[PDB]
């Protein structure tokens, strides 16, 4: 994708995430754990059930149209017929496959980047005592029990508290 | 001592392999196809109002050909002809056949309504065994073919006001004698001649005397032509012999009602789109199935699948 | 101490709700509407030529029905054909209507060019009650009503050499007589033909003798041909009988001209694009007003309204 | 929007900037200000103006046509006719959906990259004496008058002038 | 001390412009074109077999006018018709031209077979200076000119099955004699006429007597019809008179073929897509050639030029 | 582009550089040098040379259609071959306009996007021991002679090495 993270830094997606998109692993002085990111997901989410159906419309309704297939040899008024149906059904086939395309496009493009604004957001709250080490995972340069992890996640992590002795583990 | 915090997403064992600006293929955790490109092969009767031509055309049960009288002011949301259907009656052609066919089942009806004509010096509801009904000679239901009265055929004059609020369709016929003897035998006349009008249309037909292919025991011909007339309109025939004429009119619709081609045979079930093939699900925005559709249908494309990522990349 | 530097952008108290392929509705400081809704109702009389046809067709000014006769020689850019039209002269039909209505109009002018025709042995300026030219009879003024000569009908033979670098249009006719007494009466021949060609082309038509619903007095009927000549190409006519004479030709034009039908008034402003519902602005793409349109105009869509944000995102 | 900025980590817009699009608040030692910044502010509106105009052309000049409206039935002419005018009518209908989708995400998208580069831009004149509070805010770790924001917002600070002081003062 | 790694990227002394979302003009490093906006002027002919008509129009060469006679029995996937093509044998005309030339074009051949009709009591092989065959009189080679024989014309009969797994095409004629001198020399009656009919189609021509314009010689004219008979159908013909009969059928056939007109020389070379300017290349997308294209290739747009960018943004 | 990187902080591009689309200048003790980022490069041009032939299918294959120029006036059915072929070429000359103009926008923003994700993969390797100087160019606060270049360019640069070195520099 357009922004690295996706196939990218982050080396391999996580099979065992099994109730969300986005999240988290840990490991500190209490064993290791994962969880998922709640507001990345479903924004996501939110994004991709409505695209087919934003665009296409609802679907149009029709009846009475013109004869498509023929028995019998006609000439001119036969040709327009077919010439019509042909040129309709070329001009859909293409606006078919380049919908297709551009979606999906964007639908990864789209996923990369709400990988990429949690790793940033997640970062910014851990200031100067953290370093990123280039593979999408932060060295936390404190202790960092169970409850310190749980308030990174829940966004309310006080990067004031443990910076002296964050500076200290790292300078 | 410290901690580790690692960023990262799901993925799933296997994905789906679709298409970008950027990739033929690449693997997404999901996806979804959106061409259509199977059908039960069945036609539901529902939501539409479907009618099975069965044997018949639609011409023919306009007409009236009498193994097809059952259809008699029957409607229909869409009409459904057999390939298996024929004629039974006497040997015919319609000029501009494609367009009657079309403007009938439009309409979505076989509403008839007779009139009372009078057909004064010549004898009425000719028949033929050319075209039985019941065990009897006969004739389509909704002509009259009309003859010599004695040794004479007068010239008809007869008028019929439109005072309705709707469009009248007169179904008509000129019959095409194979002899000079035949001609002479039923009109008198050596040659007729058929004028149908109104206040701002009218048609002539002159009958054609010749062999064509023999057909059910004949070699003659009747060519069918119709007339509208608005309201406030009036309808004039006008022959001296030949005349294969009207017993009313048909009541003219308009509305969502079609016609269609099919050998599907026709399930008990709910669909919204028909094609020849059978009912086809519309949840898809597309199908592959037949560019001929009726109803709220997906939209015909030339390629039989497109797949649609609902999902990230899926890196394992 | 120290210092802050906060980064951020604007935002209004109100925005505009827009949809993007990833909100179906999300608010941005500002947008454009891209489709046309509205019209002023009124039809502008610039930069294009438009021509009022008022009480009569396009074709009812092309063959000189005489309270049209006010149109003669006129040119347009648009005609416009309003509901309260009403033919008053001969009663007549037009074969493929549809086809000479439209050419006419693509041309762009009623130039017509008398020329010396010459009619050996028939009556020439027929009229009919049906067609008063004041309080006597009269006749289409761009046509010739021939009728017999003392007790005789000639075949009509003569002919009309191209020598212009233009295509002339001919318009020429053939009577229906309501009876044999009056086929017989007019033209004295039982049954009469029209042949017009010219070195390519050929057209040869045969008249009906029968009644028709009275129209203005009358059971009788015209029908109006027409053949174009090319230069360096011929006419050729050839009748006993029957035969709606031309009086000359119409000169041949190509360009922007066309037709509509509409009852919007025509006032005096200036707009580039003309719908029957009226003119309206060319500024935005698209426009919802009306599938008929001449000149620059928006195409037409279903959607009565599309946003076009212009704006970032509104975050108040 | 793809970038996080706007609608993300910048909380919300200010009301009260009504000369641009992008720009700068401050707080130091001579009380507070505000200011817009010019380059960003014109980049997102160049692109934006043009835009409708750069696809569809001029509009097309069409005059005589095919009829579109018919007082008799007439089967298979008429339907021809109708069917050419409605299949045109349902394929320019597509494009117009299309298009206005694909230009308001862009739109979206580019709007939030240009508040996300002029941040970027910002972060790196500063270097190591400024940190990212996260929330599109720069903690400044010096002494910095009104002369000292205004060469920030010009592009001409000078961080070596400050590094002694602010390294000082941030550790 | 110690170092420094400087990030960048290539770029190059020319440079190329391209149109985008966002910039009308933006320098890129590279593009490629995505308009074919020139030909050599030439039409290759392969892989397409291309047949030149030189003089000849297709209906020419289908008729049988002497000079064409060339094209007997001959095949093609593009038939090209020059300008400067002529008719060279009787006048005539055919009612829709346009149909017989487009069937024929599709069906890609112009394969004969003669049948053996029998055509009892009129003189066979008629002939005219005014379509001579070498030093003497001739007349179209597919087609059969009867005229009386003795002091009679007697009612023609004839019928020919179709027992064959393939369409007949089967072309024929009626004559409109200039004079009424004429009409009785060849065919005794005063008025002739022709039917012919399959067992669900039937046609009937009444010829016209009069002059046309003077053309090689003649002031009359024949009308050219055309019947298809499926197998297992059969043909019909009945003539008392200004009869033209077919000689045999042309075989139908089912394909990729068509016609064009161009004034195009004929070149030994390869290309897929032909234009009536001459062949054109098919790697690029789109072209601005020419609307009317046969074969692979690029679709037509109104732009002569459009750049695709295959390289970053140019900044030297 | 979006991502700032190319005509941005990327002042301008390397006429010098012929063997890549991406890649490294540097200066150190023992002179000066550059070299082409392969990955990079190829990533960029896997997407672009298959970009036209992805969307558009294969080209059509026509034959027999409608005629498209006419010698004479004929009418209402004339008018309706000659509107068919009008909205035919309308439509698709509406569709390559659209199609360029998208792709080169992405192309635009894809490559932008691959100097942006170069430079930012860079600084991660480097960590704490080089600064960003702004202009796509990193200072190094460590001696670093070409094998250490070579060891960044190549991506098995160790950071723990040069760490206790560069931070003194750095910050003292
Ligand atoms: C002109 O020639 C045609 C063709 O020969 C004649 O048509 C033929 O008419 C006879 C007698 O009506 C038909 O005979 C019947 O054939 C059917 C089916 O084959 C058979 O079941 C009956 O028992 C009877 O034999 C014959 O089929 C028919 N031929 C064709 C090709 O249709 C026509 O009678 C001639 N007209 C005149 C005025 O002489
Ligand atoms: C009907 O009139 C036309 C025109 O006068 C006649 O055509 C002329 O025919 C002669 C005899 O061959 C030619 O020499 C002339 O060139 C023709 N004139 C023109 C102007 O083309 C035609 O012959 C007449 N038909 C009848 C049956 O008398
Ligand atoms: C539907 O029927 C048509 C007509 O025989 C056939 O050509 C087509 O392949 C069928 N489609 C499917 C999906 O079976
Ligand atoms: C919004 O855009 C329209 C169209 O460009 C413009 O006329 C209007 O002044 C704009 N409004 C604001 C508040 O910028
Ligand atoms: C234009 O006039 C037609 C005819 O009355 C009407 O059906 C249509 O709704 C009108 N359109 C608008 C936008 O008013
Ligand atoms: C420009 O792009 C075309 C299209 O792929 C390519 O064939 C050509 O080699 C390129 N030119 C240069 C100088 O890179
Ligand atoms: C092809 O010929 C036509 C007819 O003269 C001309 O208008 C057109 O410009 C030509 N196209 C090219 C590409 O030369």
Redesign the interface.
């Known amino acids: 994708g357009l922004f690295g993270a996706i196939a990218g830094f982050i080396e391999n997606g996580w099979e065992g995430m099994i109730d969300g998109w986005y999240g988290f692993r840990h490991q500190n002085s209490e064993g290791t754990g994962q969880a998922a990111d709640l507001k990345s997901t479903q924004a996501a989410i939110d994004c991709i059930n409505g695209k087919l159906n934003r665009v296409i419309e609802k679907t149009n309704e029709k009846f009475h149209q013109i004869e498509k297939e023929f028995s019998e040899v006609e000439g001119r008024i036969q040709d327009l017929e077919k010439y019509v149906e042909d040129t309709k059904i070329d001009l859909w086939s293409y606006n078919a496959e380049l919908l297709v395309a551009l979606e999906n496009q964007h639908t990864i493009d789209l996923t990369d980047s709400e990988m990429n604004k949690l790793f940033e957001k997640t970062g910014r709250q851990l200031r100067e005592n953290a370093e990123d080490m280039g593979n999408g995972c932060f060295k936390i340069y404190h202790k960092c029990d169970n409850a310190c992890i749980e308030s990174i996640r829940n966004g309310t992590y006080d990067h004031d508290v443990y910076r002296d002795e964050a500076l200290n583990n790292r300078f | ?13 296997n994905g789906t392999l ?7 293929q ?1 693997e ?1 955790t999901n996806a979804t196809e ?2 259509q490109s199977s059908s039960t092969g069945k036609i539901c009767n529902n939501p539409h109002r479907i009618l099975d031509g069965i044997d018949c055309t639609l011409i023919d049960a306009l007409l009236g050909d009498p193994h097809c009288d059952v259809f008699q002011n029957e409607t229909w949301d869409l009409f459904v002809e057999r390939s298996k259907a024929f004629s039974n009656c006497y ?1 015919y ?1 319609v000029p ?1 056949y ?6 009938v ?2 309409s979505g009806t076989l509403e008839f309504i007779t009139e009372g004509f009078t057909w004064t010096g010549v004898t009425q509801n000719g028949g033929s065994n050319a075209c039985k009904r019941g065990p009897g000679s006969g004739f389509f239901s909704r002509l009259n073919w009309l003859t010599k009265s004695g040794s004479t055929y007068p010239v008809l ?1 007869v ?1 019929m006001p439109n005072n309705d609020n709707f ?1 009248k369709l007169y179904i008509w016929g000129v019959h ?1 004698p194979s002899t000079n003897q035949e001609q002479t035998s039923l009109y008198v006349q050596a040659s007729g001649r058929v ?1 149908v ?6 048609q ?1 037909i002159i009958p ?1 005397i ?4 023999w ?1 059910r025991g004949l070699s003659s ?1 009747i ?1 069918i032509y119709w007339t ?1 007339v608005k309201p406030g ?2 309808l ?1 025939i ?1 022959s001296n012999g030949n005349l294969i004429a009207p017993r009313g009119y048909f009541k ?1 619709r308009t ?5 269609m ?1 099919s050998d599907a045979p026709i399930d008990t079930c709910i669909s919204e789109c028909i094609t020849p093939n059978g009912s086809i699900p ?1 949840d898809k ?2 199908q592959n199935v037949n ?13 039989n699948t ?11």
Do not use: E, W
Request: glycine share 6%; net charge positive.
């Open positions: 001592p410290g901690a580790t915090l690692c960023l990262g997403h799901h993925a799933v064992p679709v298409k970008t600006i950027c990739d033929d690449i997404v959106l061409v040997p052609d501009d494609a367009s009657l066919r079309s403007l089942a439009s004059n008028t469009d095409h004028t009008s109104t206040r701002r249309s009218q002539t054609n010749g062999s064509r292919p057909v011909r060519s509208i309109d009036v004039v006008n003219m509305g969502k009602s079609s016609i081609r519309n925005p597309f560019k001929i559709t009726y109803g709220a249908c997906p939209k015909y494309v030339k390629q497109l797949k649609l990522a609902t999902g990230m990349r899926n890196v394992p």
